[PDB]
Structures are given as C-alpha cells and as structure tokens.
Amino acid sequence: MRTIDCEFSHFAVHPGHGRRYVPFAFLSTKPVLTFARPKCFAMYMRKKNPRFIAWTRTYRRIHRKTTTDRVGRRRAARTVRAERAIVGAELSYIQEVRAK
Amino acid sequence: MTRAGFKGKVLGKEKKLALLEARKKAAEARKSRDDRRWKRVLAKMDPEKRKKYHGVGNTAEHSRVRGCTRASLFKRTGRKPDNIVMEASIHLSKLLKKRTFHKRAPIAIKRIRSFVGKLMKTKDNRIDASLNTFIWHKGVKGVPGRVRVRVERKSETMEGGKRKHFYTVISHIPVPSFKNLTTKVIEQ
Amino acid sequence: HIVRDVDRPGSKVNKKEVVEPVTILEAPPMVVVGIVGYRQTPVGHKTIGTVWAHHTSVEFRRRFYKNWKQSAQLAFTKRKQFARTTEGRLAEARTLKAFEKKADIIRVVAHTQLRKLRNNRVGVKKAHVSEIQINGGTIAQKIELAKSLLEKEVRIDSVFQQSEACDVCAVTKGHGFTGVVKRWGVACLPRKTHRGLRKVACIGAWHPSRVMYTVARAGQHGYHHRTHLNKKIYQLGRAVSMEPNQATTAYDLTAKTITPMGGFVGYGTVRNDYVMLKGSVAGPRRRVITLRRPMAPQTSRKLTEKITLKFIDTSSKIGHGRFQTKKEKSQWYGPLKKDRIRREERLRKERAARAAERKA
RNA sequence: CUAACGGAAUAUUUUUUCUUAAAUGCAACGUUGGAUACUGGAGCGGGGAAGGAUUUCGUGCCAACGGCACUCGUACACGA
RNA sequence: AGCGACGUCGCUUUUUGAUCCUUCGAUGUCGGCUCUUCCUAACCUAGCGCCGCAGAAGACGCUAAGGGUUGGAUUGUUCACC
RNA sequence: AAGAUUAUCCGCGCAAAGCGGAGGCAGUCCGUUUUUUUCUGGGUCUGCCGUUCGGUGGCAUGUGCUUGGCGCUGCCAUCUC
RNA sequence: GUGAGAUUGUGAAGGGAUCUCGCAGGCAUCGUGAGGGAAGUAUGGGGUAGUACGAGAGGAACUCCCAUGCCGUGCCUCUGGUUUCUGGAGUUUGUCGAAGGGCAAGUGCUCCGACGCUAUCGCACGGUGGUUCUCGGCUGAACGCCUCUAAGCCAGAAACCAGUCCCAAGACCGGGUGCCCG
RNA sequence: UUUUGUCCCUCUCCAAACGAGAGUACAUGCAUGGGCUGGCAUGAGCGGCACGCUCCACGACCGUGGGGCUCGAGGGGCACUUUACGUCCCGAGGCGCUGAACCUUGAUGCUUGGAAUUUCAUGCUCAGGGACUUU
C-alpha cells in the first residue's frame, strides 16, 4: 500500500508503476518525486508550465477547469447565529450584561 | 449471480426455461431429410435444395428468421442475387498498415474490389470515377482512411468476357462519422 | 503486480510490504468423464481400462468428431445406448474387477467445459481432454472416489488451497523461423565482416568432417513444450458477481473485479474464476495452459510461506496504466463536453418525454 | 490507378430445364479519357557533332524477335 | 615432512630436431577474432590420505575432467610482460 | 485365454467346496449329438407375452451455468421402442 | 499348400492385373516410453567467535541460518527500450487562387506515442534416488599372535546410473477408446 | 453415404508446408458498427462588452425569464453631424467606417484519431459451401 501521487500529474501511483527521482529540498528535505510516464518527466524537464499544461493537476486547478460550480462553492454550509445567555445564571444578570 | 435471494424467481425460471429449452431442443428435423436428398443429389448437384439446406437454427427462430428471411428470400432458397444498391462505410485501419507507403493504396483499390465481392457475395466490381480520384487523393502514401460508397450490384443480360453476366457499380459519396455512421442498404 | 507482506527468519527485506508480478489464469471446471487404469507391466504403463460419462455433450463431441462442420456428430451413440446395458454388460463390473485386480496408475479422464464462458478471442472451441493421475489411498478408495466423481465437476480449489507451488506444462510463445542468434545466443563479428554477419566463424573440423551437433542453426524458436516447475498459486477465484462485479480484495475495500482497466489484450476477459500465480507465465498470450502438482518437496523459506495476499493493484495497461480504476478515472475528468450535464440533463427530460409517450 | 474503347476482352460447367450464385481463362501489356506521381531545363527537355542511316513515316501486320510480354515497335511485311 | 646429489632406468610427445613416405596437372602461408567439442599430466570446485599441518597458513598425496577457469596495458604477434 | 474346456449363461468365489443369480411362449429354415460326456440342437424368419433402454410429455427437484439465456439430473406421466 | 467372384486389363485360338474373398478397412480419438538426450555452479552474509586452537602474536571450522553469483532455463505486471500505428499532436521548406484541408519533400521534419517486440536496461524459475571413488571401517583367517582381507561385510566423493526434464518407441512399438466398414 | 481433405476461413501458428481453428449459425459467425475502452492533447468554427460561460428558475427537454460571472486589442488613416436634409455635436469630440490583426481567452479535458493483432453490448447489418476425394 501507500500511493504517492505522481506530483506533476498528481496521479496516484500505485505500488508499481512509473519511476522515481529524488530531488533536493531545504525548506523541508530530500524528496522523492515520482513521475508517471516519462512523458510526465520529460515535460517537466522540458520545463513546461504546469499552469498551462493541459494534463496536469495544476491545469485543471487553476484554469476555469476546476472552477466554481463543481466543488469551489462557498457561503452555503450549515450554521446558526442567534442570541446567547451567560449559562449558570438567573435572568437578571443576563439582562444586566446585555443592556448597559 | 443473477437470482439468489431475489425470492421465488426460481420456480419461475425453472419452468420458464423448461419451455424455451424444450422449444429449442424440439425445434428441428435435421440431417437425414437431406440424406433423402443425397442419394439423388450424388446423381448430380441441386443448389436450390442446397443453400437453404445448408443452414438450420433452433435458438434463433423468432430473431434469425428476420435476417435469414430476406437473404434466404431471394438467396438461400434459390440463390439469384439482386440487383441491389447499398451505400457503405469501410475501415481502412486494418487495411492500410505496414507495407510500403508506395503500395498501400493501389493495393487498397484491389482490395476494395475484393471487399465488395466479399460483401456482395456475389462477385465483380466496377468503380465510379470519383472513387478513383478519391483514392488517389493524396496518391500512394496516405489515402484517406475511411470510405463512403454507394454500391450497386446491378443485373446484366448475357454480356462480356471471361465469365460475364451480372455486374456492379461502386461509388464515392461522403460525410464523416463514418466509423459511427454506418453503411445502409439501399432499397430498390 | 500484487502486494503482500514479507517475512522470513532473517531476510534483509523481512518485515516489508512488498509489491510483486503475478499471473491470472482463467478457470471454471473441468468435468470428470472417465476413469482409467493403466497397469504397469514390465514394459511400462499399458492402459487397462477406461470408464464413461453416459451423457456426451456437443462440444466435446465437436472435438470428439474431428470437426463439427458438416459433422453428423454420430460418435458415442452406441456408447450412448449403454444405459440399457445396466441390463446388459456390467462392464463396470468387469472394469473394476480389472482395476482391482491389476491396475497401477489411475488416471482420470477429464475434459474441460471449453466455452469457459469466454466470448471472443481466442477460439479452438473444439474441446479438450487429458488423463490425470489420481494418487492417495487405496485403489478402491481412489476408485470410489473417482467413481463418485464421475460426471462430477472439478474446481481447482478441490485439488488446491493457494500459497502453493504447482508445476506447469506449456507451448512456447512462437517465433517462427528463427535467427539462430535468438535461438542460441551467439555473438557477431565486426563491422568489416564481409559476407554476412550473424552467421558465426567456426562450426566444424576436418576431423571430424561429420558436422558436429553442438552447434545448432536457426529454426523454429518458441512453440515448444516445456515442462516448467515451481509457480506459486497466489489466489483461487470464484463467481463473477454481476452487472459489473465479483472481486473484493480487502484493502481494495471497493469490491472490484479481478480485471485490469484493460484486462488482457484481445481478451478483455475474466469471464469466470481464476488462478492467481505469483510471477509470470510461459507461452503465447491468450492460450490454454496446464497446471500439474508440484514435484519438488519445496520446503523452503518460500514454501513455508504466509503468502496470503492482501492486496493487488490492478492497472490499466493499455494506453498506459495511468489512473487506476475507470471509477477513479471517471471522477477526474467527471464533466466534459459529452453527456454529463449539458447533454445528459437534456437527455434525462428528453428520455423521460419519449418513455412516457410510448406507454400512455 | 481508373473508366471507356477497340483486338481472337474469346470461353466455360452441369444436376437443374436451368439460369444468378458457386469454380480459372481472356489481353498482365493497345488506345482514348480520366485519375496519381516522377523528372525536374547542366532535362528523361530541345537542338548539333562524330557515329548511325531508314532506323523515319504511311499502311499493314504479329512467326520469330524485342531476356516479361504486346493485340506495341527502332520488328517483320509493304510502300512511302 | 619435504627433498634429492651422485648416479641410473623409465615415460611422453601441445617441443625441437632428424628423416623426404606422400604431397608440385595444387590439400589456401601468420596471427588473432569467433565457435565447439574433446583430452588430462586437476589450476579452481566435491571428497579422502601426509605433513618438518598447534592454531594460522601452507605443503604433500590420492580419488576426481561432472563443473568452473578473467579485464586491461604495452607489444602484428607468438611468446613476452605489467 | 482357461482347462490338453466349443457346450443352453452369467455372476461370485485363490480356489476348494460351494454359492447365487440365469424369462416365456407359439409359429418358422436346417440338421446332430463328436477336441472322449451337447444331449435334441443348430439356425435364422415371425408371432405372441414382459426388467432395460429409447423416445414423448408433464410435474417437482437436485445440479450447473450467460448479454436472466445456455446446461443437465429427480420423479411422474406419456410416448416408443 | 495352392480359392472365387466382380472389377479391371490388353497387339495376335487368351493371359493377367487390379480389387475384393471363408473373417479388410477407413476414420477418429486417446494413450505407453524403448531409446536418445539431459544442468546447474561456486563464492558471500548471518552465525559460530574473536569461540575453538593458540602462550601470545594471533586465530580457525560445521550444522544452522540468510544471501548472492554465474550459468542455465522461462518471462513482460512493471519499467526500460524499440516505432512505418506514417496514431496523435507539433514544426520547416515548398506546393495546391482560396482559408480549410491535403500534397510534395523517395518514411520532409520534431515532440508525444500504445501495441507488439523486447533488455540481465525489465520480470520469473532451477527435482531426489542409486551405485560407487578414494578412504575408513567393521568383522577377520591365513599364520595358535596379528592384521579392514582373504571369505564375509558396513559406510562411503562435485564421479557415474536413474528419478525430473526434453524427443517419441524399432523407416517396421505397442495399449485404449469413438464412430463408419468390410 | 463414414468421411477427410478441399470451396469456405482464423492468427495463435506461420518461410512455404505445417499448425491451430472455424462457421456452422443468435444475447452467433459477420460486418456496419453501436456502446465502450484509449490516446493525443483543446478543432474547425465562432465570439469578446455581444456572445460565451455560469447559477437559479420556469417551460423542465424546449422556448424563456431572472441572477451571477464573463463581460481580450496593436492599425496607415479617412469620412460625416452641411445648402433646414431636424443630421436637430456646431466645433471640442463623438459615431462609425477603413487593408492586416498578432497573441489570447472562451465556448473546448476540445478537436481528433483508437487496428492488422482493443473492450464489450441486453446495438446494428449482412450472410452463412463450392470441389472432391470419397468405401
């Protein structure tokens, strides 16, 4: 078990499949990046822009392609906002705090 | 797993199936009918007995009779190909593979004729000029890989060389989605 | 490839999860159709008797006729009569008597149900048979058993239980007429190799002029029987569940199929039950293959294993393996120009309108 | 490549009555049209020199012959 | 142990010589590459005997040819040689 | 092959010894008894009567399996032989 | 010892072929293995143990256990590699009034590329019997002692022989079965 | 007659032989070819204040409305707002027009292609044998 996601693509790399490089990383450490189809490596190498690459995870994300209606919608989750008491108090203290 | 716990369905099938099977099983009289024909038939060849004698079908007959009856209808009881026009769609992919850029297409042409015979089961192919161009559209190397015909097996009187007497025209006609689209048989 | 856990007494890779290549082999039942006694004579096995089916199916006949074609199928028909011969030859009495009396290897005549529930590719729909020796207590007991199993059907599990090493007999994958090189592995000469190259320098001596055989030459390569040993059965399958299902694969947690996204070229198959063997397999693709009991005692770190699958990854392959499960895959794109919403929604009402109209 | 034409583009079989079908010829070779290419002007083009000289054309015509082959010709034949 | 002088017989023929049988109306010269197989006078491997083998290490011998038996450098090589 | 065994059978049983099991009926051609012991045979044709089968159908059920179809058995009955 | 009948046969007052003749074959199927061939191989770890051994210096060994090699032999999930899938996509030059969209460019040209192939650049797999070798022995007479030795006998090596594996039994092996024959 | 072979026909076999099969016919063989699986990687086309997109809704397929989002520029220049022709901007400037756009984004994860030897359907079509050995 343990699927890495081939980053670039993002795609879950099941236990087999694909190939693995170890990069450097100082703000964390030492990663491994796993690439799926060398097509994914090569493009990477070819230093294309994930922000425009069709096939990437980026590309959907950024691009209208993920966007709004599918899952990015906000301001619709359940809530309650309403007027609240002290808790552990007679009615007079609750009036006194709220009032003046 | 199409039954279990989907209660009582069981009795229903076992019997129901009991008919369809029975019916199927039942459904013919067979080979010896033909052996009554054979002793005579070895005395010399009768195809009007033969094309239909050659086939049978016991699980098909509410549906096979549908395809068989047309085709039996001029053809399996006494041959006699029409004289038909159909318009077709062919898959060049298997066809164009491998061998030489420089030969695939002429050979395709030959093959086109051949398919046509193969199709018309009943042989001989004349081609429309358009097709001719259509083909040589690039000229060898490539060709367009999907073709749209209107083909007519048409009947002829006594004519021509070799073996002539029945004949075909096959023609281009176009508009893609060929691989979806289908061929259809042209009502006459 | 499959995932399962490592361990042994003191291996390097003990305690690891591992991922491994495995094979899948289509399986349903063979049906037992005869019993055979060959007896050992001081000249080897000579068959002494053969015991029968009493009902003879068409396929098996199709093979049991050299063909179907125009086949009148008339084989077995007299044999077929023999139910009468309950009141008639108690052949069974004689056979058995012989068996007891003399038989020395018992083989069972079994043949396959050869549609295998497969659809298309491949064919040889003719049908197939083979003798199977049965070993394990007492001729009679065997026999009884056999006898009991006459007409009865076999599932692999009845002779197996998985984790097991079994042995294999198969025909090589074919290569036709072969470059001797592939056939034997010789090494060339330079670039300056006048008058050809593959065809190596030294092949016989003056003495002995008699061309030696420890040289070979080209020829067929592949298409051989080979009788290969030690293939572990890693799993024994059953009952394809439905309108899409069977599998379930633990950590799959999904209830998948045991079929890849592709699931074998020309062979999108899995059409019954399977044998999962660890490792790969001989021969040409798409072909029938013979499992035989292992002969090695197999005592091993390997046998002696808790190989007890967990989990199997189940790629595509075909187009490349890129996104496990069409299910997953489907998600990722989800919506697209097709269907979906902007066509399916239209479709749902449209469909609804048509459906309603035809009924009313 | 193709359609067409034109040559001895010639045939076929028989139960059946029989004929389409179901099994090979023709002529693999001509042309005209058509369709596709190629050369790629330092031409496979177009013109001399020597060389050749009837090979030219017309008409015919097809045994050999042109290493296939011709129903085509620098062939033959017959003339021009 | 292991040797082995002085002797003194062996033994072999992947040496080298001698001999000219044969071969000149023709048996294609080097080397090397490749490639096989074979031989054993076993280098390594299996297993025994000895040890001037404590261990250690080597040595000696047997039984053994089934199995194994290298990359360069330089050098046409061969041999040579690191 | 099982005894130097061809006669109304088989089965069983080393083998003994022994055992069991073993259809009929009429009509029909031909004719012996004899590997030293049938004993009426032989021989076909029919007829006539009945386990089995074989088929027919049905009813349950068991079994088994796909694009719910394919595949097969119980029993029953029928049918036929 | 020595048929017949048919079929069949031809060049000479007839023979014979052919077939089929007092018990034919076909087909099919399934089988046995003679006999042939025949393969694995060594070093590494763990460990023993820093133990033995050694006074020290130093400094070993098996099972056992894990491995690995090379070799062999399979294989393609994966990965790699391979691309005339003229597959996609991309690009130049030219080429088609004209975009489109094709073309040429002797596979124009790149990037992508399944599949298939395939790589120790990928993945898998490599059986236990016998007889002996030396050799040691055991017993043990000769030879009143003794001796492995004669007799007898035990045990025995990477050797050989088989199992297994690869061929399929005599151009002339045969068994078992289905169905048609005669 | 029993055939097997051969017409017929498969790709696993495959140099050829040979092989392996085969249909033998219906949830078939068979192809159209469906579906569907891929792959490559957003078409042509059209559009940029409209239109697209997106949300909601109605009509539910639709028409349609609403809401929201969206709501791309570099150009040599040139006309015309006049004689009353109500153009009722008279110039400022505004409105357009005016050869090419270039890239872009959008509709579009598009578009497009997926066999030789892909996956399959509760799709479609088509059709299913000539020979001859021959006992």
mmCIF file of C-alpha atoms in Angstrom, chain A residues 2 19 24 74 79 84 94:
data_model
loop_
_atom_site.group_PDB
_atom_site.id
_atom_site.type_symbol
_atom_site.label_atom_id
_atom_site.label_comp_id
_atom_site.label_asym_id
_atom_site.label_seq_id
_atom_site.Cartn_x
_atom_site.Cartn_y
_atom_site.Cartn_z
ATOM 1 C CA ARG A 2 0.816 3.816 0.009
ATOM 2 C CA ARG A 19 9.581 5.807 -11.991
ATOM 3 C CA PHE A 24 16.684 18.289 -3.002
ATOM 4 C CA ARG A 74 -18.628 28.873 -0.663
ATOM 5 C CA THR A 79 -24.604 27.407 10.556
ATOM 6 C CA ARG A 84 -26.931 33.697 23.697
ATOM 7 C CA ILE A 94 -28.260 38.147 31.570
#
